[PDB]
């Protein structure tokens, strides 16, 4: 499935700001979708990206 969209929906949480960085970015991070198999594994990678706290 479009693990991508559903990995975004988490964002919302979050607010306005984090969710726009997976919405650019749709070719770095679908990648980690067929990494890891993992949600705790991706959004470990966006702390220290943007540095949503």
């Given at each position: ?13 979050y607010?306005?700001?984090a ?28 702390k220290?990206?943007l540095g949503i706290k």
């Amino acid at each position: 499935m479009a693990g991508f969209l559903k990995v975004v929906q988490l964002l919302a949480k979050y607010g306005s700001k984090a969710v726009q960085w997976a919405w650019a970015n749709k070719g770095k991070i679908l990648d980690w979708l067929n990494a890891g198999q993992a949600i705790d594994w991706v959004v470990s990678k966006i702390k220290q990206i943007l540095g949503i706290k």
